Design a protein around this ligand. Structure first.
Ligand SMILES: CCCC[C@H](N)[C@H](Cc1ccsc1)NC(=O)c1cc(NC[C@H]2C[C@@H]2C)nc(N(C)S(C)(=O)=O)c1
Ligand SMILES: CCCC[C@H](N)[C@H](Cc1ccsc1)NC(=O)c1cc(NC[C@H]2C[C@@H]2C)nc(N(C)S(C)(=O)=O)c1
Lengths: 378, 378
C-alpha cells in the first residue's frame, strides 16, 4: 500500500448531472473554492460576488497577490454564460500537484444559468486548449501555465465515479483501472477532439457513414452531462436502442429526455437495455479499439421523488448540432488519460464504474477499420 | 464571519508534552507528513526510514523533484538527537501560505530518543535562525527560504491550545487573542532570545538580580515542554511557590518533576497554587510589561492512570544549565507573535488558554524598570 500519486486519489466530488469538482486554493492569504473539472472549455473562472447558488466566492480585495489585468471577459457555454473581469493570482491544488503557479483567473461578477443549485462548486477549470479560450488564444489556460511554470508532466487523468472520483495531475495511478489502456489520437488541440469510426448497439452496427459520427467534431467533455450525438446519429441510435429493448415500452418523451421513468428501489431491469460501443481511431494505421458502456451509464439517476423507494432515471443520450460530445456519463465507465504530451487520450475500464453481475463496461481491441482518416470533418 | 487568514486557523494538533505539529507536503508527487513546530531549532528534517514510532516517512526515491546535497547532518537537542542526509525538495503547507518553495530538507535515517511514541509527528520544523542551524549557518532554514522565495511577510504567530492550535504564517489573526499585544525585543537573531527583567510569584518579587534570569540566555521555544529556569532561579522559584501554596503539602520529588500528584476527575484545587508573572523588556526605554500564567499552565495533565476519574499532573517548571526556556506550557496561555521583520515578539492573552472563573492568564503594562540592558548576559 503506497502509490506515488496516492494523495490525489479521491480528490473529486460530485455527479454527472451537476458536475465533478476539485478543491483549488487561490490568492494570499488562502481562499479555497470548489471548482468544476471541465475538459470542454479553457477558462479558469470563479464566482467573485454573492449569488443565490453560491456558498462562497472569491474576494479579490483580500488577496494581496491578486493582479488586475483591466480586461473584461465573457464566456458562453451550451448551458449558460457568465461575465467577469480578468486578472492573475497564485493558485494551488491542495490534493493535486505540490506546486503553486500564477495563473489567469476570471472573476465572475454576473451570470445566467451557469451555477447549479446544490452542485457545491463555485468556479470552473477549463482544461482544454488556448484556441478556444476567451477573449482569445492569448489568455493562457491554467494547465498550460502549470506545465510552463513547473516540472509537472504535461498530462492528467480522470476517473469519474457515478452513483466522487480522482484527477491525477502529472501522471497515472494504476489502482484506478483494470485491463489495458487503449489510446486514440487527439486530432487537433482546441477541444479534446477525437474520431469515432464505428458505432454498435448490442453488437449491431448502426451502419452510418463514419463522417456522420464526427460531423463537425467529436470531443471528450467532462463538463457536459450526456453523450450528445449529431441529429441523424441520435435518431438512428434511439431507433436501434428502442428495438433492442422491446421487452418493455417507454414514451417517446423518455428518449427525448423530456420524461423520466422510475422503478421501485433496486429493481431497475438493466438487462432489458443494450450496451453501446463506440469505436475510436487507434494509434496505428487501420487499427481501432472500442469502448462499451452499459445502461447504468446512459440512464442516469435523479433525486428520489420523495426520499422513498423510487429510482428515477433520465435518458442521458441527447441531440446536438455541434458534433458528438462524450460527456460525464460516458467517462464514468472508464479511467480517461488526457496525455497532452503525446497528443492522445487513453481509455481503460474504470475500477469504480457502475455495473452488475452480468455485464461490465469494456475497452477492447484491436480491430481493423479502413479509411478512418476520412471520418473527420474538414 | 470571514477573517483573511481563516484557512490557517486550527492548523495545529498536539499537546505540550508531546509537541504541536502542522501538516507539510514535501516532494512530487505529494508526500504529506506531520511536522513538529519548533522555534527552538533551525533545521527542517523528516523521518526518512521506518521507525517503531513512525506511522509514515519521507520516501525520497518516489520524489522526482528531490535533489541530493551529498552531505550528512547531525543534530543534537536537549532531548534526543538524529543523523541524516541533506537535500532539497519542494515544500508546501496545505493549511499555511498559498505558495510552494524549494527548501533544504534533512532526511532522518537514524535517531536516538528523538521521535516520541504516540505524538503523531514524523518530522521537525526548526523556525529559529541560521546561526544555530547544522552543519552551520550556510544551511538556510525553511522560513528564510519562504521569505526570500515568496511574497509572504517575514512573520508568523502561534496560538497553542492546551488541554490543537493555530500557526498563522505571514500575519496575525485577531480572533486568536483578546486585549492588546505587547512586544519584547528579539535581543539577537539565533534562538528567539529575549530578556526577562523581573519575576513575581503571586505578586511577590523573587528579588533576584535580573542577570540571573537570563544567565547565559532566555529563549521562546515552542518545541520544549516546560518553563525551564537556571538553577539558582529554579530553586528560588520553587521555594516561593511552595510557600504560596502551603494550604497543602507535596513531596519534594513533585517539585523536581520526579513525582506526579493526582486528583479525582475535575477536583484540582487550582486556587491553592499561585500565579507566576514574568516581566519582559519593552520596546521603549525603561518600559516593560508582564505576562502572567496560571497553575493550569505550569501543572500539565498526564494520561489518566487507568482511563478512569483521575487527573494526574506533573510540575512543568524545571531546571536548566543553558538559560531560561519559555516552553509550550508558557506559550499555551498566550498568542505569540514572532515578528521577525521588526525583530520583536508579541504576547497577548490567548482566546483559548485554559483558565477558571476566578483567574485568567494576563499580559499587562506598561511598568517602569530601570537598567534592563544590564540584565543580558555577554
Ligand atoms: C460550448 C460547450 C461548453 C461545454 C462545457 N463543458 C460547459 C461547462 C458548464 C456550463 C454550465 S455547467 C458546466 N458544459 C455545458 O454547456 C453543459 C453542461 C451540462 N450539465 C452540467 C455539467 C456539470 C455537469 C457535468 N449539460 C450540457 N448538455 C447540453 S447535456 C444536458 O448534457 O446535453 C451542456
Ligand atoms: C538544544 C535545545 C533543543 C530545543 C528543541 N526545542 C528540542 C526539539 C525536540 C527534540 C525532541 S522532541 C522536540 N527540544 C528539546 O530538546 C526538548 C523537548 C521536550 N519535550 C518534547 C517537546 C515536543 C514537546 C513540546 N522537553 C525538553 N525539556 C528539557 S523539558 C522536559 O521541557 O524540560 C526539551
Amino acid at each position: 500500500r503506497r502509490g506515488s500519486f496516492v494523495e490525489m486519489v479521491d480528490n473529486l466530488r460530485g455527479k454527472s448531472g451537476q458536475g465533478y469538482y476539485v478543491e483549488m486554493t487561490v490568492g494570499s492569504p488562502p481562499q479555497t473554492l470548489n471548482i468544476l473539472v471541465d475538459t470542454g472549455s479553457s477558462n479558469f473562472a470563479v464566482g467573485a460576488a454573492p449569488h443565490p447558488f453560491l456558498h462562497r466566492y472569491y474576494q479579490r480585495q483580500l488577496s494581496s497577490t491578486y493582479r488586475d489585468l483591466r480586461k473584461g471577459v465573457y464566456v458562453p457555454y451550451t448551458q449558460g454564460a457568465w461575465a467577469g473581469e480578468l486578472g492573475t493570482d497564485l493558485v494551488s491544488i491542495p490534493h493535486g500537484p505540490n506546486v503553486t503557479v500564477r495563473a489567469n483567473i476570471a472573476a465572475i461578477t454576473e451570470s445566467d444559468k451557469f451555477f447549479i443549485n446544490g452542485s457545491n462548486w463555485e468556479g470552473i477549470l477549463g482544461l482544454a486548449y488556448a484556441e478556444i479560450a476567451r477573449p482569445d488564444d492569448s489568455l493562457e489556460p491554467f494547465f498550460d501555465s502549470l506545465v510552463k511554470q513547473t516540472h509537472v508532466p504535461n498530462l492528467f487523468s480522470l476517473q469519474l465515479c457515478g452513483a466522487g472520483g480522482s484527477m491525477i495531475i502529472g501522471g497515472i495511478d494504476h489502482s484506478l483501472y483494470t485491463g489495458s489502456l487503449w489510446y486514440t489520437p487527439i486530432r487537433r488541440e482546441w477541444y479534446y477532439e477525437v474520431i469515432i469510426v464505428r458505432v454498435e448497439i448490442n453488437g449491431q452496427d448502426l451502419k452510418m457513414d463514419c463522417k456522420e459520427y464526427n460531423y463537425d467534431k467529436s470531443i471528450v467533455d467532462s463538463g457536459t452531462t450526456n453523450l450528445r450525438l449529431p441529429k441523424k446519429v441520435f435518431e438512428a441510435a434511439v431507433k436501434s436502442i428502442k428495438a433492442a429493448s422491446s421487452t418493455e415500452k417507454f414514451p417517446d418523451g423518455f428518449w427525448l429526455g423530456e420524461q423520466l421513468v422510475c422503478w421501485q428501489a433496486g429493481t431497475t431491469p438493466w438487462n432489458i437495455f443494450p450496451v453501446i460501443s463506440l469505436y475510436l481511431m487507434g494509434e496505428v494505421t487501420n487499427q481501432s479499439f472500442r469502448i462499451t458502456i452499459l445502461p447504468q451509464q446512459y440512464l442516469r439517476p435523479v433525486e428520489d421523488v420523495a426520499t422513498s423507494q423510487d429510482d428515477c432515471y433520465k435518458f442521458a443520450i441527447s441531440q446536438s448540432s455541434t458534433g458528438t460530445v462524450m460527456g460525464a456519463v460516458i467517462m464514468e465507465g472508464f479511467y480517461v488519460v488526457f496525455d497532452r504530451a503525446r497528443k492522445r487520450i487513453g481509455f481503460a475500464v474504470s475500477a469504480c464504474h457502475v455495473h452488475d453481475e452480468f455485464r461490465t463496461a469494456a475497452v477492447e481491441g484491436p480491430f481493423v477499420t479502413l479509411d478512418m482518416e476520412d471520418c473527420g470533418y474538414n
